[PDB]
Paper text:
We conclude that N332-GT5 consistently induced BG18-like type I B cell responses in RMs.
We determined cryo-EM structures of two of the high-affinity Fabs (RM_N332_07 and RM_N332_08) in complex with N332-GT5. Thus, an antibody having no recognizable BG18 sequence features other than a long HCDR3 can bind to the N332-GT5 trimer in a manner that is highly homologous to BG18. Thus, the BG18 type I and III Fabs structurally characterized here have clear potential to develop into BG18-like bnAbs. Furthermore, we provided evidence that N332-GT5 induced a wider range of non-human primate antibodies with a common BG18-like epitope footprint and binding orientation even in the absence of substantial sequence similarity to BG18, which suggests that N332-GT5 can prime a larger number of BG18-like lineages than originally anticipated.
Residue numbers in the entry:
A (entry chain A): 33 to 57, 66 to 141, 150 to 185, 188 to 309, 312 to 323, 323A, 324 to 397, 412 to 457, ...
B (entry chain C): 1 to 52, 52A, 53 to 82, 82A, 82B, 82C, 83 to 100, 100A, ...
C (entry chain B), D (entry chain I), E (entry chain G): 521 to 546, 572 to 664
F (entry chain F): 272 to 309, 312 to 321
G (entry chain E): 80 to 127
The structure:
């Protein structure tokens, strides 16, 4: 003899996909539309609540990807569009005074650029990296993108430095944070807590190696959608960071010319001192220990008596064959073949790096950006907090892979799930309406 | 086991006041409703008052609505009753009882599960 | 705290209804999210109003429990079960219950109108 | 079904109020349409609240019918007339009725406050 | 008229509550303003609902006045004071009062549920 | 036959048929289409 | 026929230099000006 009683405000929630708000504490990522963060955010532990998570079906990754691309494009829109730069270049090798086994990496290109008035042209001598030009057939060159896309110049006043971005639930929704140590990105999570916003996630854009991210609480964690499927990427989250010191040692001098009313073109003018190659320093012992830990964790899935071999990326665009990253305002492409070249059976390392000014990001074709050169010598120190690996028999072979930015977000968003609150419910009580 | 132990007064002149205090143990006090049931020395028993598990609701027999107040302190595991204007018809043994009501989300009671030994109130 | 009772029993969680009720309401994509959140909130308030529960968080009705929906004891539901487990167990019966609640309130409104019509 | 009673008598149509009530709520141009629809819904709910009808679909009041608004018999209105015809016939009197309903509820609220003030 | 009672005493101003209540509801920047205005309105209506005042403009409660919040006489508050002055004097105590009102209504809802459970 | 004002010569008459009339339309010439690049990322398609 | 309601016995402290209506008017005037100029001839060829 029980009756239906209606309850509103019950702690019941169903998985849902919604739009999250942006919050943050010139900069390409800083946005005036992001709400100031909570000076002391509340986190509520949900005792005795088990929630099934799946980081590869987490729609927060797709929103972050869309928001990062949208902010990038909005930043580039109010900037100089270098349409006049797709001209025939007449290039010679930079040829510095001293011999340096890097001849031809920097070219001294002469071209006729536009100016403030449409009846005059200005002869310009600019330095370009070898990777930014192709030969037409002094030799004639064109920019790599004049065949595919127009150049939008990034504004020199807007920094590319990643800043933390917090994603906050809209009212009616909640974000569940896993907090289950050694959680592998899928399955039941027993330490679930409710948060108003995510932690601060830096929009670090890199391939192969994950920089300035979160670290594992106790052990290296290997996460994959399907560990046996060779077409899926493996995200390795480290418990200890590996410090990487990357520099652009050449003292590049930046020059600027006016190309139209209100428009100026910034270009690599000269090199002071000697030409020196960009490079990254990784401690050899630390990396060797890091790989030993990764191999142990991989053996847990692939077999205690198998052989794990690391090798360089087999091919594709430089974006995916090298470790792409941006620090100091410059875009670096580091080989990494010295880090993944070993077979694991039952003082410092230096990585050569190339720098590019014409960057095609977010694997898009048709929208190229020109990164202005940064005056002086630049150096950055960052933490390697995770790896991206792919897999190709007793011996298994792993390669850096990478290139899909969604996986970089996944390495931070794997702990969060968005749920819709369903405040209505009914239950039988001994309670009859009058 | 479950035990209810009454503490209270004795002979009080007509028209005065007396308060009973009943201690309980062996069960969660806050999970059960409590009642007081009265038995005159030569009669059977009658219900006098009922209090909910939380203490918010009290019910009384019409003849005692203006004289008796029932209250409960769930932190002290104590059920007390206070009566004023003690009439000659109110002399009796007053028993604590556990049961008699439940708060909608529990199975029905409408009976008394546990009894104390009884305080004797005389005039 | 908000949803802190999610792992608690239905009885214990029924005492924190105002925490979630308060937290439910608290460019184009964000405006769509806010308008949709408001529409959802209003749909739930309208649905409570249709049932005669417009001002209550705990609203008792005149619809009996069929026992086919769930044949559990009150102690099994209120003391040994959470709201997430309960919601899962009767997720296939909420439209039947909602329909019965709407019909029952419509009958109640007609009965109240007729009782008020007695001079 | 939604509006299926539109051609039915007022009496018959009064039994389907929840169908329309549920259906009323169910880039820039569409957001403006949705926000305006919500504002209209809320204005109607606020107006019912002002009259003391916040939780009812059929709400009886203390305002007498003047008979100048319509001198028809109850059978003429409820059995021989539809809601569209009725709405047309009194379209010139709804502001008078709404004003009287608001004043009557204000008096009722003051009377309830004073009755509750008696120790 | 709207806010015409702002300079009047609290007693005199309490008789015009429907004028302001009606006036409260009556590209991207304007949509944000309208959505926010709706969210604010709904927050105030939800808050009244939590207190059990969902359908009232003048709602009496079971929360006693502490006298620490204000030790003024009723004539000093209702006859010799305006609502702006009163709001300023207790602006530091409204969260305490709101918390007490929410707790009191939660207790009332549980008591009503238990009273309805008596066969 | 539908018109806003059938007697007003300035209004159009819309005639809705009860049976359709099948019309077979073709471009019988085997036109060959050529394409040239006219700028970065831009191509002009023309009748070759 | 807009309504103006005198607020008898109401004193309100004003500060025209902290009045956010000025910033909105400034933004709206600039926005309208720019919107008006957008669908118009851009005289890029005139810088000769
Ligand atoms: C990972 O995080 C570290 C630390 O936040 C990043 O390194 C930092 O990068 C910024 C921007 O390049 C450096 O600021 C610069 O400092 C020089 C100092 O002379 C100054 O001239 C510049 O104008 C600018 O202020 C900052 O010092 C540097 N910190 C360290 C410790 O090196 C790193 O870049 C991040 N990794 C990635 C991939 O973004
Ligand atoms: C790019 O090449 C031009 C031409 O070869 C360089 O300009 C010459 O610089 C030398 C420096 O000793 C002068 O003697 C010549 O008269 C210059 N000729 C012209 C036409 O300018 C220019 O310096 C080179 N750019 C860089 C960065 O090395
Ligand atoms: C620039 O234009 C002149 C003709 O005015 C031409 O002779 C010269 O070769 C051009 N320079 C380059 C680098 O194409
Ligand atoms: C020019 O673009 C085509 C595709 O449009 C591409 O296949 C080709 O490789 C590009 N040229 C160079 C030198 O990369
Ligand atoms: C959940 O949190 C508690 C906090 O003390 C911890 O002891 C427990 O190990 C956590 N669960 C898992 C699976 O780690
Ligand atoms: C790198 O890790 C160390 C570990 O203590 C931390 O102190 C440092 O701030 C980290 N740096 C970055 C850029 O995350
Ligand atoms: C990191 O993880 C390895 C296992 O992969 C463990 O042996 C090591 O002690 C851990 N170190 C820290 C600092 O957590
Ligand atoms: C992650 O853990 C779950 C635990 O149920 C397991 O089923 C799944 O295969 C694991 N995946 C990987 C890549 O280790
Ligand atoms: C995972 O990959 C294996 C092949 O290695 C395939 O047979 C299996 O169906 C895949 N499972 C999922 C869930 O993708
Ligand atoms: C780079 O060259 C500039 C030239 O003015 C000089 O001031 C600066 O100190 C140099 N920096 C380094 C690191 O050589
Ligand atoms: C990076 O630079 C700092 C500067 O003090 C140095 O202490 C650290 O050892 C360097 N790391 C590597 C891997 O070279
Ligand atoms: C370190 O390098 C040596 C090189 O011989 C290798 O044998 C060893 O497995 C590596 N890892 C550790 C943890 O020593
Ligand atoms: C691999 O070694 C670990 C060491 O603890 C052991 O627990 C695990 O069962 C071993 N697996 C196999 C397949 O031998
Ligand atoms: C990295 O260095 C090795 C050295 O043999 C070379 O074969 C490889 O092509 C280099 N990687 C890239 C991307 O150039
Ligand atoms: C979780 O379960 C334990 C079981 O001992 C219980 O004591 C505790 O109250 C539960 N937590 C909540 C929030 O109900
Ligand atoms: C209970 O549900 C069953 C299945 O829908 C139905 O056949 C039965 O008539 C229902 N009983 C009551 C009393 O509603
Ligand atoms: C329409 O009018 C006919 C008249 O015979 C009546 O029988 C029928 O019920 C009416 N329809 C509705 C929906 O009321
Ligand atoms: C009825 O309406 C008329 C016309 O507005 C008015 O003169 C009359 O006083 C009204 N009577 C009542 C009782 O409201
Ligand atoms: C303003 O104050 C005067 C004082 O004489 C009073 O008569 C008048 O009613 C007040 N105005 C209002 C709107 O209350
Ligand atoms: C009145 O307020 C004071 C100060 O907050 C507090 O100490 C006191 O207990 C309150 N009294 C009541 C009856 O709420
Ligand atoms: C359409 O029909 C209506 C029927 O009232 C008639 O008045 C009107 O003139 C007609 N129009 C045409 C164009 O036939
Ligand atoms: C229709 O056209 C006639 C002229 O042919 C004109 O006299 C008449 O007023 C028109 N009516 C309307 C409604 O346009
Ligand atoms: C048109 O010409 C092309 C030339 O390759 C030929 O393949 C195609 O079949 C021709 N079609 C017709 C309809 O003549």
């Amino acid at each position: 003899n029980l009756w239906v009683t209606v309850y509103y405000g019950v702690p019941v929630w169903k998985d849902a996909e919604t739009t999250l708000f942006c919050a943050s504490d010139h900069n390409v990522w800083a946005t005036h539309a992001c709400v100031p963060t909570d000076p002391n955010p509340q986190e509520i532990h949900l005792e005795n609540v088990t929630e099934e998570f799946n980081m590869w079906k987490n729609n927060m990754v797709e929103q972050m990807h869309e928001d990062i691309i949208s902010l990038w494009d909005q930043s580039l829109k109010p900037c100089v569009k270098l349409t006049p730069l797709c001209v025939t270049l007449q290039c010679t090798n930079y040829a510095p005074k001293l011999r340096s086994m890097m001849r031809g990496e920097i070219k001294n290109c002469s071209f006729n650029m536009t100016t403030e008035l449409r009846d005059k042209k200005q002869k310009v001598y600019s330095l370009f990296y070898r990777l930014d030009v192709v030969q037409i057939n002094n030799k004639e060159y064109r920019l790599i993108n004049c065949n595919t896309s127009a150049i939008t110049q990034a504004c020199p006043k807007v920094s590319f430095e990643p800043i933390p971005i917090h994603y906050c639930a809209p009212a009616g929704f909640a974000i569940l944070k896993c907090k289950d140590k050694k959680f592998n990105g899928t399955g039941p999570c027993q330490n679930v807590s409710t948060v108003q916003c995510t932690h601060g996630i830096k929009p670090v854009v890199s391939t192969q190696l994950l920089l300035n991210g979160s670290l594992a609480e106790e052990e290296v964690i290997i996460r994959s959608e399907n560990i046996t499927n060779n077409a899926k990427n493996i995200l390795v989250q480290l418990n200890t960071s590996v410090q990487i010191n990357c520099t652009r040692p050449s003292n590049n001098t930046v020059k600027s010319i006016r190309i139209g009313p209100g428009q100026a073109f910034y270009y690599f003018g000269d090199v002071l001192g000697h030409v020196r190659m960009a490079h990254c320093n990784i401690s050899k012992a630390t990396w060797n220990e890091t790989l030993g830990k990764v191999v142990k964790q991989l053996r847990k899935h692939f077999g205690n008596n198998t052989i794990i071999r690391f090798a360089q990326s087999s091919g594709g665009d430089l974006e995916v064959t090298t470790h792409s990253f941006n620090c100091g305002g410059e875009f670096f492409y580091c080989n990494t073949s010295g880090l993944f070249n070993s077979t694991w059976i039952s003082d410092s390392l230096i990585l050569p790096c190339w720098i590019k000014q014409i960057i095609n990001m977010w694997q898009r074709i048709g929208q190229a950006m020109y990164a202005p050169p940064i005056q002086g010598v630049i150096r950055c120190v960052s933490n390697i907090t995770g790896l991206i690996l792919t897999r190709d028999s007793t011996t298994e072979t792993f390669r850096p892979g990478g290139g899909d930015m969604r996986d970089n977000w996944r390495s931070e968003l794997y702990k969060y799930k968005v749920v819709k609150i369903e405040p209505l419910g009914v239950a039988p009580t001994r309670c009859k309406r009058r | 086991e479950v035990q209810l132990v009454e503490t209270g007064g004795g002979l009080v002149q007509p028209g005065g006041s007396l308060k009973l205090s009943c201690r309980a143990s062996g069960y969660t006090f806050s999970s059960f409703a409590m009642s007081w049931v009265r038995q005159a020395p030569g009669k059977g028993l009658e219900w006098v008052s009922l209090i909910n598990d939380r203490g918010g609701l009290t019910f009384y027999v019409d003849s005692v609505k203006g004289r008796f107040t029932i209250s409960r302190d769930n932190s002290k595991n104590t059920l007390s009753l206070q009566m004023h204007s003690l009439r000659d018809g109110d002399t009796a043994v007053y028993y604590c009882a556990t049961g008699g009501m439940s708060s909608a989300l529990q199975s029905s009671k409408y009976y008394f599960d546990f009894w104390g030994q009884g305080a004797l109130v005389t005039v | 705290g908000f949803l802190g009772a999610a792992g608690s029993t239905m009885g214990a969680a029924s005492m924190t209804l105002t925490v979630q009720a308060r937290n439910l309401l608290s460019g184009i994509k964000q405006l769509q999210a806010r308008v949709l959140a408001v529409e959802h909130y209003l749909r739930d308030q309208q649905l409570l109003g249709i049932w005669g529960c417009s001002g209550k968080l705990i609203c008792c009705t005149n619809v009996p429990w069929n026992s086919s929906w769930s044949n559990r004891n009150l102690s099994e539901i209120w003391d040994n079960m959470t709201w997430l487990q309960w919601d899962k167990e009767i997720s296939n019966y909420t439209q039947i219950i909602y329909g019965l609640l709407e019909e029952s309130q419509n009958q109640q409104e007609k009965n109240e109108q007729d009782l008020l019509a007695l001079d």
